[PDB]
Amino acid sequence: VKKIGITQLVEHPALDATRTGFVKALEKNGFKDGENIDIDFQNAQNDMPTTQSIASKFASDKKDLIFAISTPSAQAAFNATKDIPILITAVSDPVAAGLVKTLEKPGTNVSGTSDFVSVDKGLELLKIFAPKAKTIGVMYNTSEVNSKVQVDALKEYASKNGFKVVEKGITTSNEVNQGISSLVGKIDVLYVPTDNLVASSMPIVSKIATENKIPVIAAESGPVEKGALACQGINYEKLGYKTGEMAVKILNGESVSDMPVATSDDTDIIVNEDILKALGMEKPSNENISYVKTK
Ligand SMILES: N[C@@H](Cc1ccc(O)cc1)C(=O)O
Description:
Helix 1 (about 15-30) packs across helix 11 and helix 7 (about 175-185) runs parallel beside helix 9 (about 200-210). The protein has helices at about 15-30, 50-60, 70-80, 120-125, 125-130, 145-160, 175-185, 195-200, 200-210, 220-225, 235-250, 275-280; strands at about 1-10, 35-45, 65-70, 85-90, 110-115, 135-140, 165-170, 190, 215-220, 230-235, 270, 290. It is an alpha/beta fold. It has a 5-stranded parallel sheet with strand order 2-1-3-4-5, with helices on both faces. Strands 7-6-8-9 form a 4-stranded parallel sheet, sandwiched between helices. The two termini are about 40 Å apart. The protein has 12 helices and 12 strands. The chain has 2 domains: about 1-115 and about 235-265, Response regulator (Rossmann fold, 3-Layer(aba) Sandwich); about 115-235 and about 265-295, no CATH class. The structure holds tyrosine (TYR). Keywords: Signal. This is ABC-type transport system, sugar-family extracellular solute-binding protein. It is classed as transport protein. The entry lists the keywords Substrate binding protein, adhesin, tyrosine binding protein, lipoprotein, transport protein.
């Protein structure tokens, strides 16, 4: 029986979706929990020390494979073991996180999928929902390398395309209230990168932003379900399913160190119709938009 450890940072929609897809891929390929695999699922509940203790225990348990969901969980798994294969998902920038040498040839015990998406995809939506906006706010966790890379990308785009960026770096969930509140009066739109801290506090961000008539564009649909206005993002269940197919390969003997990291080029526009209505906006004509209601 192959023993798989799954280390997930926290329940937020994107991370949950990757776990769902990964398990379905393994099952479709004949690997079934309680039969020829054992899945030990561990949630850190957003606690950074717990990402490290989960990973430590998976290494001392001698798991056959570790599936790590998010940058923090992956970094912890990599710190814990350089021998057990680690498959990642929902990692924005595996190279910047120190997990792989290159995407095409990791050269380490880590491979999997990246949730990289260009800032351009979300900022395209300004033409639709805030066509006169000139100042973009971004709140993010200064401890997440995934977020730092995306903020740099945002600033590069803004410098190219005539926008101002106002940053609010935080490190704790207790800072969210004053952080979003402080951006009121100073921004035309909020961009939410794939930041685990902010994604976990989206209902708060949404409530204050929407009361202040600030559109919030997120990088992916989880925050939209939790009260952001819109996104043009990837499908995280599919990303997880791809990672499970790569697991099948590793369980069957393929070398993780030569397995290329996979990404998705397929995005979909999803809008929260409740938030749209609260902002006094009309549904645009665009046939490719799908609508969600608040989770
Ligand atoms: N990209 C994040 C995970 C994440 C995904 C979706 C989000 O909305 C937020 C965070 C990481 O590298 O850890």
